[PDB]
PDB file of all heavy atoms in Angstrom:
ATOM      1  N   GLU P   1      24.407  -2.660  -1.559  1.00 11.49           N
ATOM      2  CA  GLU P   1      25.507  -2.458  -0.627  1.00 11.49           C
ATOM      3  C   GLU P   1      25.010  -1.599   0.510  1.00 11.49           C
ATOM      4  O   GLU P   1      24.496  -0.512   0.307  1.00 11.49           O
ATOM      5  CB  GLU P   1      26.686  -1.812  -1.317  1.00 11.49           C
ATOM      6  CG  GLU P   1      27.241  -2.642  -2.448  1.00 11.49           C
ATOM      7  CD  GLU P   1      28.655  -2.220  -2.850  1.00 11.49           C
ATOM      8  OE1 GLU P   1      28.854  -0.996  -3.108  1.00 11.49           O
ATOM      9  OE2 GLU P   1      29.522  -3.088  -2.910  1.00 11.49           O
ATOM     10  N   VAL P   2      25.189  -2.110   1.746  1.00 12.14           N
ATOM     11  CA  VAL P   2      24.642  -1.477   2.934  1.00 12.14           C
ATOM     12  C   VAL P   2      25.754  -1.313   3.971  1.00 12.14           C
ATOM     13  O   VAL P   2      26.728  -2.071   3.977  1.00 12.14           O
ATOM     14  CB  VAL P   2      23.433  -2.207   3.513  1.00 12.14           C
ATOM     15  CG1 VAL P   2      23.831  -3.567   3.989  1.00 12.14           C
ATOM     16  CG2 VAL P   2      22.739  -1.423   4.592  1.00 12.14           C
ATOM     17  N   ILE P   3      25.597  -0.299   4.804  1.00 12.18           N
ATOM     18  CA  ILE P   3      26.542   0.015   5.882  1.00 12.18           C
ATOM     19  C   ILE P   3      25.813  -0.251   7.207  1.00 12.18           C
ATOM     20  O   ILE P   3      24.721   0.297   7.430  1.00 12.18           O
ATOM     21  CB  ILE P   3      27.057   1.432   5.814  1.00 12.18           C
ATOM     22  CG1 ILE P   3      27.746   1.682   4.501  1.00 12.18           C
ATOM     23  CG2 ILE P   3      28.051   1.691   6.945  1.00 12.18           C
ATOM     24  CD1 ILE P   3      27.860   3.144   4.127  1.00 12.18           C
ATOM     25  N   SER P   4      26.412  -1.075   8.078  1.00 15.91           N
ATOM     26  CA  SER P   4      25.765  -1.451   9.326  1.00 15.91           C
ATOM     27  C   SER P   4      25.940  -0.344  10.354  1.00 15.91           C
ATOM     28  O   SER P   4      26.511   0.704  10.137  1.00 15.91           O
ATOM     29  CB  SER P   4      26.330  -2.744   9.836  1.00 15.91           C
ATOM     30  OG  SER P   4      25.896  -2.988  11.161  1.00 15.91           O
ATOM     31  N   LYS P   5      25.368  -0.599  11.538  1.00 16.90           N
ATOM     32  CA  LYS P   5      25.494   0.330  12.680  1.00 16.90           C
ATOM     33  C   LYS P   5      26.922   0.379  13.221  1.00 16.90           C
ATOM     34  O   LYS P   5      27.324   1.410  13.791  1.00 16.90           O
ATOM     35  CB  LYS P   5      24.494  -0.037  13.760  1.00 16.90           C
ATOM     36  CG  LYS P   5      24.429   0.932  14.912  1.00 16.90           C
ATOM     37  CD  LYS P   5      23.325   0.474  15.853  1.00 16.90           C
ATOM     38  CE  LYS P   5      23.205   1.388  17.042  1.00 16.90           C
ATOM     39  NZ  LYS P   5      22.157   0.926  17.964  1.00 16.90           N
ATOM     40  N   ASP P   6      27.680  -0.690  13.035  1.00 15.76           N
ATOM     41  CA  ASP P   6      29.085  -0.735  13.368  1.00 15.76           C
ATOM     42  C   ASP P   6      29.982  -0.188  12.268  1.00 15.76           C
ATOM     43  O   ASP P   6      31.193  -0.379  12.369  1.00 15.76           O
ATOM     44  CB  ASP P   6      29.502  -2.172  13.693  1.00 15.76           C
ATOM     45  CG  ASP P   6      28.703  -2.755  14.802  1.00 15.76           C
ATOM     46  OD1 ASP P   6      28.417  -1.996  15.766  1.00 15.76           O
ATOM     47  OD2 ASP P   6      28.388  -3.976  14.746  1.00 15.76           O
ATOM     48  N   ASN P   7      29.409   0.436  11.270  1.00 19.34           N
ATOM     49  CA  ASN P   7      30.179   0.954  10.118  1.00 19.34           C
ATOM     50  C   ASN P   7      30.878  -0.207   9.396  1.00 19.34           C
ATOM     51  O   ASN P   7      32.093  -0.199   9.233  1.00 19.34           O
ATOM     52  CB  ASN P   7      31.146   2.037  10.561  1.00 19.34           C
ATOM     53  CG  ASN P   7      30.443   3.268  11.054  1.00 19.34           C
ATOM     54  OD1 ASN P   7      29.508   3.186  11.852  1.00 19.34           O
ATOM     55  ND2 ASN P   7      30.902   4.447  10.605  1.00 19.34           N
ATOM     56  N   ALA P   8      30.095  -1.196   9.020  1.00 15.94           N
ATOM     57  CA  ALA P   8      30.574  -2.361   8.293  1.00 15.94           C
ATOM     58  C   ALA P   8      29.945  -2.366   6.898  1.00 15.94           C
ATOM     59  O   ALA P   8      28.724  -2.279   6.794  1.00 15.94           O
ATOM     60  CB  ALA P   8      30.253  -3.647   9.034  1.00 15.94           C
ATOM     61  N   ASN P   9      30.769  -2.482   5.878  1.00 16.40           N
ATOM     62  CA  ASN P   9      30.333  -2.472   4.499  1.00 16.40           C
ATOM     63  C   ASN P   9      30.051  -3.890   4.050  1.00 16.40           C
ATOM     64  O   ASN P   9      30.988  -4.675   3.928  1.00 16.40           O
ATOM     65  CB  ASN P   9      31.373  -1.815   3.620  1.00 16.40           C
ATOM     66  CG  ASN P   9      31.607  -0.353   3.975  1.00 16.40           C
ATOM     67  OD1 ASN P   9      32.694   0.030   4.409  1.00 16.40           O
ATOM     68  ND2 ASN P   9      30.604   0.462   3.736  1.00 16.40           N
ATOM     69  N   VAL P  10      28.782  -4.211   3.794  1.00 15.64           N
ATOM     70  CA  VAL P  10      28.410  -5.575   3.363  1.00 15.64           C
ATOM     71  C   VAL P  10      27.531  -5.469   2.128  1.00 15.64           C
ATOM     72  O   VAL P  10      26.975  -4.411   1.819  1.00 15.64           O
ATOM     73  CB  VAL P  10      27.705  -6.343   4.473  1.00 15.64           C
ATOM     74  CG1 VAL P  10      28.705  -6.803   5.537  1.00 15.64           C
ATOM     75  CG2 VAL P  10      26.624  -5.504   5.117  1.00 15.64           C
ATOM     76  N   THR P  11      27.447  -6.582   1.398  1.00 18.30           N
ATOM     77  CA  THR P  11      26.576  -6.635   0.207  1.00 18.30           C
ATOM     78  C   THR P  11      25.531  -7.718   0.437  1.00 18.30           C
ATOM     79  O   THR P  11      25.817  -8.823   0.945  1.00 18.30           O
ATOM     80  CB  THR P  11      27.418  -6.920  -1.039  1.00 18.30           C
ATOM     81  OG1 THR P  11      26.540  -6.843  -2.185  1.00 18.30           O
ATOM     82  CG2 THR P  11      28.100  -8.260  -0.999  1.00 18.30           C
ATOM     83  N   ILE P  12      24.310  -7.416   0.081  1.00 19.38           N
ATOM     84  CA  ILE P  12      23.181  -8.324   0.274  1.00 19.38           C
ATOM     85  C   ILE P  12      22.335  -8.393  -0.984  1.00 19.38           C
ATOM     86  O   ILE P  12      22.397  -7.517  -1.875  1.00 19.38           O
ATOM     87  CB  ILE P  12      22.310  -7.862   1.456  1.00 19.38           C
ATOM     88  CG1 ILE P  12      21.659  -6.518   1.178  1.00 19.38           C
ATOM     89  CG2 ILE P  12      23.094  -7.792   2.740  1.00 19.38           C
ATOM     90  CD1 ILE P  12      20.621  -6.158   2.182  1.00 19.38           C
ATOM     91  N   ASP P  13      21.542  -9.467  -1.051  1.00 20.20           N
ATOM     92  CA  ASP P  13      20.480  -9.607  -2.053  1.00 20.20           C
ATOM     93  C   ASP P  13      19.221 -10.054  -1.371  1.00 20.20           C
ATOM     94  O   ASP P  13      19.234 -10.753  -0.339  1.00 20.20           O
ATOM     95  CB  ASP P  13      20.914 -10.545  -3.171  1.00 20.20           C
ATOM     96  CG  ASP P  13      21.171 -11.940  -2.702  1.00 20.20           C
ATOM     97  OD1 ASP P  13      21.098 -12.225  -1.491  1.00 20.20           O
ATOM     98  OD2 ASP P  13      21.483 -12.813  -3.549  1.00 20.20           O
ATOM     99  N   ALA P  14      18.086  -9.679  -1.921  1.00 19.44           N
ATOM    100  CA  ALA P  14      16.814  -9.866  -1.261  1.00 19.44           C
ATOM    101  C   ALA P  14      15.767 -10.338  -2.260  1.00 19.44           C
ATOM    102  O   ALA P  14      15.845 -10.122  -3.460  1.00 19.44           O
ATOM    103  CB  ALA P  14      16.322  -8.592  -0.585  1.00 19.44           C
ATOM    104  N   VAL P  15      14.713 -10.964  -1.728  1.00 23.69           N
ATOM    105  CA  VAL P  15      13.619 -11.482  -2.534  1.00 23.69           C
ATOM    106  C   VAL P  15      12.313 -10.983  -1.924  1.00 23.69           C
ATOM    107  O   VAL P  15      12.287 -10.584  -0.759  1.00 23.69           O
ATOM    108  CB  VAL P  15      13.629 -13.032  -2.564  1.00 23.69           C
ATOM    109  CG1 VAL P  15      13.318 -13.576  -1.212  1.00 23.69           C
ATOM    110  CG2 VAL P  15      12.679 -13.545  -3.622  1.00 23.69           C
ATOM    111  N   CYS P  16      11.245 -10.964  -2.738  1.00 23.06           N
ATOM    112  CA  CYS P  16       9.966 -10.436  -2.308  1.00 23.06           C
ATOM    113  C   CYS P  16       8.857 -11.351  -2.800  1.00 23.06           C
ATOM    114  O   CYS P  16       8.946 -12.014  -3.817  1.00 23.06           O
ATOM    115  CB  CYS P  16       9.756  -9.030  -2.888  1.00 23.06           C
ATOM    116  SG  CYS P  16       8.136  -8.404  -2.586  1.00 23.06           S
ATOM    117  N   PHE P  17       7.757 -11.317  -2.049  1.00 23.40           N
ATOM    118  CA  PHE P  17       6.517 -11.944  -2.453  1.00 23.40           C
ATOM    119  C   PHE P  17       5.435 -10.855  -2.556  1.00 23.40           C
ATOM    120  O   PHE P  17       5.277 -10.048  -1.640  1.00 23.40           O
ATOM    121  CB  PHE P  17       6.025 -13.023  -1.479  1.00 23.40           C
ATOM    122  CG  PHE P  17       6.840 -14.279  -1.473  1.00 23.40           C
ATOM    123  CD1 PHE P  17       7.949 -14.427  -2.303  1.00 23.40           C
ATOM    124  CD2 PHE P  17       6.490 -15.346  -0.675  1.00 23.40           C
ATOM    125  CE1 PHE P  17       8.674 -15.599  -2.296  1.00 23.40           C
ATOM    126  CE2 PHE P  17       7.227 -16.505  -0.685  1.00 23.40           C
ATOM    127  CZ  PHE P  17       8.324 -16.631  -1.505  1.00 23.40           C
ATOM    128  N   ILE P  18       4.746 -10.811  -3.702  1.00 22.42           N
ATOM    129  CA  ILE P  18       3.728  -9.809  -3.965  1.00 22.42           C
ATOM    130  C   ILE P  18       2.417 -10.516  -4.307  1.00 22.42           C
ATOM    131  O   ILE P  18       2.414 -11.510  -5.055  1.00 22.42           O
ATOM    132  CB  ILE P  18       4.122  -8.848  -5.085  1.00 22.42           C
ATOM    133  CG1 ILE P  18       4.378  -9.575  -6.381  1.00 22.42           C
ATOM    134  CG2 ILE P  18       5.366  -8.045  -4.722  1.00 22.42           C
ATOM    135  CD1 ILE P  18       4.587  -8.700  -7.570  1.00 22.42           C
ATOM    136  N   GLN P  19       1.330 -10.037  -3.683  1.00 21.76           N
ATOM    137  CA  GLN P  19      -0.033 -10.484  -4.013  1.00 21.76           C
ATOM    138  C   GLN P  19      -0.894  -9.249  -4.275  1.00 21.76           C
ATOM    139  O   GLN P  19      -0.751  -8.238  -3.598  1.00 21.76           O
ATOM    140  CB  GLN P  19      -0.629 -11.301  -2.883  1.00 21.76           C
ATOM    141  CG  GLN P  19      -2.018 -11.830  -3.145  1.00 21.76           C
ATOM    142  CD  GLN P  19      -2.100 -12.870  -4.229  1.00 21.76           C
ATOM    143  OE1 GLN P  19      -1.243 -13.765  -4.337  1.00 21.76           O
ATOM    144  NE2 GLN P  19      -3.127 -12.801  -5.038  1.00 21.76           N
ATOM    145  N   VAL P  20      -1.785  -9.360  -5.249  1.00 21.50           N
ATOM    146  CA  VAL P  20      -2.661  -8.261  -5.641  1.00 21.50           C
ATOM    147  C   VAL P  20      -4.057  -8.567  -5.096  1.00 21.50           C
ATOM    148  O   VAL P  20      -4.725  -9.486  -5.523  1.00 21.50           O
ATOM    149  CB  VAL P  20      -2.728  -8.116  -7.171  1.00 21.50           C
ATOM    150  CG1 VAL P  20      -3.772  -7.112  -7.545  1.00 21.50           C
ATOM    151  CG2 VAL P  20      -1.382  -7.752  -7.728  1.00 21.50           C
ATOM    152  N   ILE P  21      -4.493  -7.741  -4.124  1.00 18.43           N
ATOM    153  CA  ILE P  21      -5.876  -7.809  -3.656  1.00 18.43           C
ATOM    154  C   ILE P  21      -6.776  -7.432  -4.826  1.00 18.43           C
ATOM    155  O   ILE P  21      -6.387  -6.649  -5.697  1.00 18.43           O
ATOM    156  CB  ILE P  21      -6.118  -6.940  -2.437  1.00 18.43           C
ATOM    157  CG1 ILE P  21      -5.421  -7.571  -1.213  1.00 18.43           C
ATOM    158  CG2 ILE P  21      -7.578  -6.780  -2.094  1.00 18.43           C
ATOM    159  CD1 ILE P  21      -5.783  -6.948   0.093  1.00 18.43           C
ATOM    160  N   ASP P  22      -7.999  -7.964  -4.847  1.00 20.09           N
ATOM    161  CA  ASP P  22      -8.870  -7.930  -6.019  1.00 20.09           C
ATOM    162  C   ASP P  22      -9.151  -6.519  -6.526  1.00 20.09           C
ATOM    163  O   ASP P  22      -9.810  -6.384  -7.560  1.00 20.09           O
ATOM    164  CB  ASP P  22     -10.202  -8.618  -5.691  1.00 20.09           C
ATOM    165  CG  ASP P  22     -11.007  -7.874  -4.657  1.00 20.09           C
ATOM    166  OD1 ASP P  22     -10.401  -7.111  -3.853  1.00 20.09           O
ATOM    167  OD2 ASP P  22     -12.242  -8.018  -4.618  1.00 20.09           O
ATOM    168  N   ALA P  23      -8.657  -5.486  -5.855  1.00 19.96           N
ATOM    169  CA  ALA P  23      -8.903  -4.100  -6.257  1.00 19.96           C
ATOM    170  C   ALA P  23      -8.413  -3.859  -7.687  1.00 19.96           C
ATOM    171  O   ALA P  23      -7.390  -4.410  -8.117  1.00 19.96           O
ATOM    172  CB  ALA P  23      -8.195  -3.159  -5.285  1.00 19.96           C
ATOM    173  N   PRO P  24      -9.166  -3.060  -8.474  1.00 21.68           N
ATOM    174  CA  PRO P  24      -8.634  -2.641  -9.783  1.00 21.68           C
ATOM    175  C   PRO P  24      -7.591  -1.568  -9.668  1.00 21.68           C
ATOM    176  O   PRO P  24      -6.998  -1.187 -10.693  1.00 21.68           O
ATOM    177  CB  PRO P  24      -9.893  -2.088 -10.492  1.00 21.68           C
ATOM    178  CG  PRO P  24     -11.038  -2.436  -9.591  1.00 21.68           C
ATOM    179  CD  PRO P  24     -10.498  -2.529  -8.229  1.00 21.68           C
ATOM    180  N   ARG P  25      -7.306  -1.090  -8.444  1.00 20.53           N
ATOM    181  CA  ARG P  25      -6.355  -0.003  -8.262  1.00 20.53           C
ATOM    182  C   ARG P  25      -4.986  -0.375  -8.850  1.00 20.53           C
ATOM    183  O   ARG P  25      -4.310   0.485  -9.428  1.00 20.53           O
ATOM    184  CB  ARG P  25      -6.262   0.326  -6.787  1.00 20.53           C
ATOM    185  CG  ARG P  25      -7.598   0.421  -6.078  1.00 20.53           C
ATOM    186  CD  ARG P  25      -7.435   1.064  -4.731  1.00 20.53           C
ATOM    187  NE  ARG P  25      -8.672   1.025  -3.929  1.00 20.53           N
ATOM    188  CZ  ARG P  25      -8.795   1.630  -2.750  1.00 20.53           C
ATOM    189  NH1 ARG P  25      -7.794   2.331  -2.249  1.00 20.53           N
ATOM    190  NH2 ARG P  25      -9.951   1.567  -2.108  1.00 20.53           N
ATOM    191  N   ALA P  26      -4.581  -1.614  -8.711  1.00 23.04           N
ATOM    192  CA  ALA P  26      -3.302  -2.054  -9.182  1.00 23.04           C
ATOM    193  C   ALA P  26      -3.112  -1.822 -10.685  1.00 23.04           C
ATOM    194  O   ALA P  26      -1.990  -1.972 -11.180  1.00 23.04           O
ATOM    195  CB  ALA P  26      -3.065  -3.533  -8.867  1.00 23.04           C
TER     196      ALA P  26
END
């Protein structure tokens, strides 16, 4: 739930893409 710059209450959902560079750090 996020509030916009106009003070508007909206609900959102989001997706992500993740890739692991070959580092062992992960």
Side-chain angles (χ1 to χ4, degrees):
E1 299 198 308
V2 65
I3 302 159
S4 170
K5 185 176 180 180
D6 301 322
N7 294 46
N9 297 115
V10 285
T11 186
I12 63 170
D13 62 358
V15 68
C16 173
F17 288 2
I18 59 171
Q19 183 67 41
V20 173
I21 288 190
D22 66 335
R25 316 194 186 186

